Amino acid sequence: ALSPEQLVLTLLEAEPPHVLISRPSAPFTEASMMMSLTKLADKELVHMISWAKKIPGFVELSLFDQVRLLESCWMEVLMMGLMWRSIDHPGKLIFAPDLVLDRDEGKCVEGILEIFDMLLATTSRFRELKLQHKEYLCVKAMILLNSSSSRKLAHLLNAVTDALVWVIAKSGISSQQQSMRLANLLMLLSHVRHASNKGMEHLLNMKCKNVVPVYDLLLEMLNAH
Amino acid sequence: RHPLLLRHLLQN
Ligand SMILES: C[C@]12CC[C@@H]3c4ccc(O)cc4CC[C@H]3[C@@H]1CC[C@@H]2O
Numbered sequence: 001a002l003s004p005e006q007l008v009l010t011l012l013e014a015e016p017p018h019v020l021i022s023r024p025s026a027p028f029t030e031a032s033m034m035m036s037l038t039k040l041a042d043k044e045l046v047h048m049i050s051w052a053k054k055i056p057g058f059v060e061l062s063l064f065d066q067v068r069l070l071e072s073c074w075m076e077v078l079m080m081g082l083m084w085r086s087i088d089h090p091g092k093l094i095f096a097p098d099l100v101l102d103r104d105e106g107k108c109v110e111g112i113l114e115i116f117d118m119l120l121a122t123t124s125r126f127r128e129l130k131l132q133h134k135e136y137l138c139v140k141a142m143i144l145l146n147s148s149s150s151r152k153l154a155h156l157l158n159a160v161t162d163a164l165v166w167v168i169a170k171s172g173i174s175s176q177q178q179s180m181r182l183a184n185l186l187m188l189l190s191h192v193r194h195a196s197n198k199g200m201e202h203l204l205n206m207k208c209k210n211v212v213p214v215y216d217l218l219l220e221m222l223n224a225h
Numbered sequence: 226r227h228p229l230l231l232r233h234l235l236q237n
Contacts, residue, residue: 049233066234067227220229 002056004166007159011137014054016047018085021096030109034212038203040095042218044078055141057156062149071224073147075196080140083123083192087131093119111202118195125188129181132171138164139185143192200225 002010021040024032052058052070059066085094093101093116106116138160145157164185168178206212207222214222 046233049230053234063231063234067230070230070234071227217229217233220227224226 002159004163007056007163008134008137008167010054010056011141011163012134014051015137016044016051019043019047019096020098022098028105028108031212033105033109033112034206036099037095038212038214038218040099041078042214042216044081045074045217045221048074048077052144055144055156056159057152058144061152061156065149065153069144069147071221073144074221075200076143076147076192077140079119079195079199080136080143080192083119083126084131084136086119086123087127090124090127091120111205115195115199115202118191118198122188122191122195125191129184131185132167134167135164135185138167139189143189146189 019040021036021043024036026032028036049070052066058069061069082093082095086092089100091103093103095101101116103113103116103120106113141160142157142164145153145160165178165182168181171178171181173181204222204225207214
């Protein structure tokens, strides 16, 4: 079993790489913006499965639970990553190093502007709280593990919570400020979940009306709905 | 209904 500090370091070593994607040469259309964003998502999904497998305890769960967790959390985990990438750039969504979208560029995709505004507002909350790197790592793991072998899972989630509490304690703030910071970080989990629910409705519709074709792993996740 | 995800989960 790991100490809180060691668990955090394990999460740090597990971080997935930044997928590279570029703008098309021609101006964005509804179809081409949806193509660039789903292509990004599908590649990230491959690395996400590898990340989850490195979270201590995950591969000891039943293979059924592993499927269920990833199936439930994937959009949330993508959005959390995006928000972290975007945290020091107000008005912008840093999908990848060469795909940095200004808020208004979403005007070309029907319905996406609402979701961009949710992601941007939640990102601003994390900015105002001064979310720290180690806190981000614990929260992202908590998203996976709370998305819902059973004894193992509640234990795993508790270990990650203990790790977050440990990180907050290291900041040196008062006992009541520590409780307050824990509450404020965790209250943002429901905003991430809300944005995921809305993003999933949007993408499912776009797929359904054949605005954008999706393949392989992303296709398989969407067909589950 | 998860051939790919299972394969990624099991691959090394
Ligand atoms: C799911 C959507 C396509 C993929 C987008 C994506 C793609 C990659 C990523 O890391 C984060 C996000 C969040 C916003 C997502 C979009 C919101 C609506 C759209 O359908």
